[PDB]
Structures are given as C-alpha cells and as structure tokens.
Amino acid sequence: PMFIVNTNVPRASVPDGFLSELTQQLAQATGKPPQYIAVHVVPDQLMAFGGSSEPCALCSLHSIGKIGGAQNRSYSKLLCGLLAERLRISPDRVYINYYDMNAANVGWNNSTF
Amino acid sequence: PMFIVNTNVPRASVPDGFLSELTQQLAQATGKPPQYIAVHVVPDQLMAFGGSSEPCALCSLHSIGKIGGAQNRSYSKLLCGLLAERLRISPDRVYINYYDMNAANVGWNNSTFA
Amino acid sequence: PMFIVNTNVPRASVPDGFLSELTQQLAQATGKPPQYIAVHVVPDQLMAFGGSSEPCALCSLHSIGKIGGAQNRSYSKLLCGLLAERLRISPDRVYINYYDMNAANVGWNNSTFA
Numbered sequence: 001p002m003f004i005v006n007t008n009v010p011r012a013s014v015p016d017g018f019l020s021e022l023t024q025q026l027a028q029a030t031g032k033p034p035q036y037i038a039v040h041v042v043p044d045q046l047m048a049f050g051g052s053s054e055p056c057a058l059c060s061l062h063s064i065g066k067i068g069g070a071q072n073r074s075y076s077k078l079l080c081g082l083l084a085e086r087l088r089i090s091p092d093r094v095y096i097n098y099y100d101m102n103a104a105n106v107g108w109n110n111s112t113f
Numbered sequence: 114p115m116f117i118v119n120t121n122v123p124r125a126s127v128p129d130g131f132l133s134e135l136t137q138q139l140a141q142a143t144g145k146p147p148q149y150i151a152v153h154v155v156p157d158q159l160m161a162f163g164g165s166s167e168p169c170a171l172c173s174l175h176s177i178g179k180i181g182g183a184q185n186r187s188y189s190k191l192l193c194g195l196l197a198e199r200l201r202i203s204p205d206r207v208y209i210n211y212y213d214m215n216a217a218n219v220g221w222n223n224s225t226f227a
Numbered sequence: 228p229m230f231i232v233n234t235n236v237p238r239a240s241v242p243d244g245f246l247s248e249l250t251q252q253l254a255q256a257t258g259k260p261p262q263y264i265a266v267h268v269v270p271d272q273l274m275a276f277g278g279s280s281e282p283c284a285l286c287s288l289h290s291i292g293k294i295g296g297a298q299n300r301s302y303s304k305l306l307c308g309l310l311a312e313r314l315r316i317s318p319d320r321v322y323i324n325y326y327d328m329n330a331a332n333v334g335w336n337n338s339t340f341a
C-alpha cells in the first residue's frame with residue numbers, strides 16, 4: 001500500500017512518528033512487508049469540506065490487490081481513527097479514495113510488477 | 114464530488130472565496146448537497162504544460178456516479194470557466210481527470226459508502 | 228501524457244531544465260506532440276518509503292492510450308532513470324502509477340477528448 005493524506009491541519013500538528021505509525025499500521029492491515037509501504041502527508045493545504053474550513057482530509061490508498069468491500073471498511077476505520085486521534089480531524093470530514101492497481105500499471109525499480 | 118486543482122498560479126492570486134464558489138457551483142452541477150463536497154487548491158506548483166510555464170492547471174474530479182460522457186463535457190465548461198475567471202488560466206492549459214468511484218472504494222466516517 | 232512526481236528531495240536539488248527534459252523525453256517515448264504534454268514536480272514532501280526518509284518518489288502517468296505491459300516497463304526504465312540521474316533517487320524507492328484514461332474522462336478546453 002501507498003497512502004497519501006492531504007490536509008488543512010498545520011505541519012506542527014502532525015506528531016513525531018506519524019509516518020512510522022502509518023507504515024506499521026498499514027503493514028499489519030494489508031499483510032504487506034513494510035519495505036514496500038509508502039506514506040505521504042501534506043499539511044497546510046487550502047481545502048474545504050462541505051464549505052467549511054474546519055480540519056479535513058482528502059486521502060488515497062493504492063494497492064495491488066487487498067482492496068474490496070470488507071477490507072476497505074476496515075482500512076477506513078483504521079485510517080479515519082488515526083486521523084482523528086493523531087491529527088484531530090473528525091472522521092466525517094475525510095474522504096479516502098481506494099485504488100486496486102493492476103500490477104502491470106505500477107512502475108518500481110526500473111520496471112513494473 | 115471532490116475537486117482538486119494543482120496550479121502554478123501563486124497563492125496570492127487564489128481568491129479567498131474560491132473554495133466556497135467551487136463548492137456551490139459543484140453542488141448545482143451535480144445536484145448533490147454542498148455538505149458532501151470537498152475542494153482543494155494547490156498553488157505555487159512547479160509545472161509545465163506544452164513545454165511552457167504560463168499559468169496552467171492539472172485537476173481531478175471524483176464522484177460516486179454523476180460521471181459520464183455528456184456530464185463530463187458539461188463539467189469541463191463549468192470548471193474551465195471558473196479557472197479562467199478566478200485564476201486567470203487559459204482553458205486550453207487545463208486538464209481535468211474524471212473518476213467515477215465505486216461506493217465500496219470511497220472511505221468516509223470510519224467506513225465506506227457501500 | 229501527464230506526469231507528476233512527488234518527492235522528499237528538496238527544491239534546490241531539482242535541476243533547472245528538469246521539466247523541459249521530462250517534456251522532451253515523454254514526447255520521444257509516447258510519440259505525442261509536446262503541445263499536450265504536462266509535467267509537474269513537487270519537492271520538499273513529508274514522505275517515507277519502507278519506513279525510511281531517504282530520497283523517494285511517488286509518481287503518476289496519465290495517458291489516453293499508449294499504456295500497457297511492455298510500454299509501461301519501458302516508461303518505468305526511462306522515468307526511474309531520470310529520477311536517479313537528476314534527483315539522486317534510488318529506483319527501488321519510486322512508485323509510478325499508470326492510468327489509461329478513457330477519452331470521455333479527460334477534460335480539456337471546455338470539452339472532453341471523446
């Protein structure tokens with residue numbers, strides 16, 4: 001999995017260790033080795049959710065497999081829970097877009113999977 | 114709908130009301146309540162379009178439904194009009210990628226929409 | 228093609244000329260006219276790959292066609308090569324997501340490519 005979070009919360013509100021936590025938690029959640037997990041957090045964004053500037057986030061999770069109805073519910077609980085606990089973003093102000101990528105459509109290490 | 118715009122226009126050129134205008138216009142275009150609608154503008158970007166650094170935008174619109182050939186042709190007029198007036202970007206320097214998301218593939222409020 | 232690179236490499240490490248080089252190399256790779264090619268580089272990102280903050284990149288290539296198994300392998304060799312040479316990012320710390328977009332799902336100048 002690769003996980004990207006874009007948020008209006010300020011950089012100083014991102015706690016030390018957040019990218020490590022996301023790595024660890026995504027490894028546990030997907031069963032994938034941490035080596036392949038990428039995480040990207042983008043604070044201080046100009047965004048709104050429902051016409052309001054209260055803390056919010058727009059996220060994506062891309063994986064080659066491990067995407068589906070129940071799995072995505074579980075990921076959303078995990079990830080909305082982290083954004084709430086760690087970044088003080090209400091879960092009802094987060095969207096997470098999930099992508100099940102074909103291996104042939106993911107480049108890595110000079111080739112594709 | 115959620116709408117993201119990445120642009121090389123400077124932050125000071127993005128009007129304070131732009132996110133709210135987009136929110137409202139997208140609600141009217143899609144018939145969705147504005148509470149559901151998220152908007153994100155990312156200025157000051159290092160970008161080129163056609164090998165030029167003149168103002169440009171790379172955008173996305175994600176929706177669960179309300180995406181399709183005719184609807185997308187309409188949205189492009191709406192969105193190019195807003196980017197042209199408010200960000201001074203020529204409409205031929207804008208791409209918008211449209212994504213019709215399955216409900217099971219959109220997380221919100223600790224769960225998905227499925 | 229439109230190519231976007233998100234990286235933790237700092238802005239000062241991005242060579243002058245990098246966006247032009249990408250535009251030119253993508254035109255050669257895809258056979259598309261440079262008029263339609265867009266490139267976008269985002270340095271200074273808060274990023275980790277494999278739990279490490281060593282240089283890494285998350286990238287995307289969107290095209291209407293010209294996406295497929297062998298083609299994508301070639302693009303990845305090209306693009307990882309450029310990121311290694313110019314940004315000093317190891318290839319094994321790069322992901323490139325490829326998207327073969329339906330022409331109806333790509334907005335441009337007040338209409339879609341359909």
Ligand SMILES: S/C=N\Cc1ccco1
Nearest residue numbers: 001002032036062063064
């Ligand atoms: S393993 C976890 N993520 C690998 C990946 C990268 C792009 C799609 O899936």
Ligand SMILES: S/C=N\Cc1ccco1
Nearest residue numbers: 114115149175176177214
């Ligand atoms: S309602 C408008 N947007 C909701 C949404 C978020 C992601 C895909 O669709």
Ligand SMILES: S/C=N\Cc1ccco1
Nearest residue numbers: 228229263289290291328
């Ligand atoms: S031509 C190269 N890119 C055009 C494009 C933009 C979005 C999908 O394809």
